[PDB]
Ligand binder design. Structure first.
Ligand SMILES: NCCc1c[nH]c2ccc(O)cc12
Length: 256
């Protein structure tokens, strides 16, 4: 099965990134600490929610696990996915600040920057996902649809997509545009930086954007469910690629 390789690839890659950060002394910085937090978020995703989704696939969407654990699976999924998305948004904003005015960024670049960034993205990821477990454990009608775990509460779905993906999308489009506008023998390295930024941004858009577009179009409107069933796993594929496209541009990670 195609989903059998994705769990192993995610669990291997994130362990490799965290072991390379812990072992290589040259990779101790604020940005690499934020990247280790990103790898922690996707490793928790690939360990906790991804074989559960494979189990849901192997039973034909009739959920084998009992009904008490549905509201925490949506909680873990939304929490780790919002953590990953806000991690990429904060990385894009920090790259724009560190590329537009490099003197004033390095003037304020303490480890308090990294700790406040991690605190902000995890606080946001907790606070956006807050109505999931309190309103789902006793109220099974809002987190079930025809005997399967799904977010039936579309009033949560529309607003949560709006705060979780589309406002990060409208932030990262602006910061990517202004970072390309600010990158226009350093001229040779700026082209490699532009290529890496383009690959990372368009890969994020391609990996996450079909699922949220069809998720909002589900609430605006069985083809939609069959599209969602594979676009979720396309969304899970971002968490295995995000260690690769954020580390392999630096040769120290490849030498590790
Ligand atoms: N697999 C859940 C993906 C996800 C991340 N953030 C979300 C916000 C709302 C929602 O319906 C879904 C999500």
């Amino acid at each position: 099965l195609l989903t059998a390789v994705v769990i192993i690839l995610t669990i291997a890659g994130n362990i490799l990134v965290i072991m390379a950060v812990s072992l290589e002394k040259k990779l101790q910085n604020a940005t690499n600490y934020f990247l280790m937090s990103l790898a922690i978020a996707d490793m928790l995703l690939g360990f906790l929610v991804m074989p559960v989704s494979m189990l849901t696939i192997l039973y034909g969407y009739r959920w084998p696990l009992p009904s008490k654990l549905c509201a925490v699976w949506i909680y873990l999924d939304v929490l780790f996915s919002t953590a990953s998305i806000m991690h990429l948004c904060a990385i894009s904003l920090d790259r724009y600040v560190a590329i537009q005015n490099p003197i004033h960024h390095s003037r304020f670049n303490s480890r308090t920057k990294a700790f406040l960034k991690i605190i902000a993205v995890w606080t946001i990821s907790v606070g956006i996902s807050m109505p999931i477990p309190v309103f789902g454990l006793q109220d099974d009608s809002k987190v079930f649809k025809e005997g399967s775990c799904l977010l039936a509460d579309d009033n949560f779905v529309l607003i949560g997509s709006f705060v979780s993906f589309f406002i990060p999308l409208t932030i990262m489009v602006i910061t990517y545009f202004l970072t390309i506008k600010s990158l226009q023998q350093s001229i040779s390295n700026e082209q490699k930086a532009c290529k890496v930024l383009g690959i990372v941004f368009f890969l994020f858009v391609v990996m996450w954007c079909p699922f949220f577009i069809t998720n909002i179009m589900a609430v605006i409107c069985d083809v939609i469910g069959a599209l969602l069933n594979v676009f979720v796993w396309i969304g899970y594929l971002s968490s295995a690629v995000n260690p690769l496209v954020y580390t392999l541009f630096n040769k120290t990670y490849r030498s590790a």
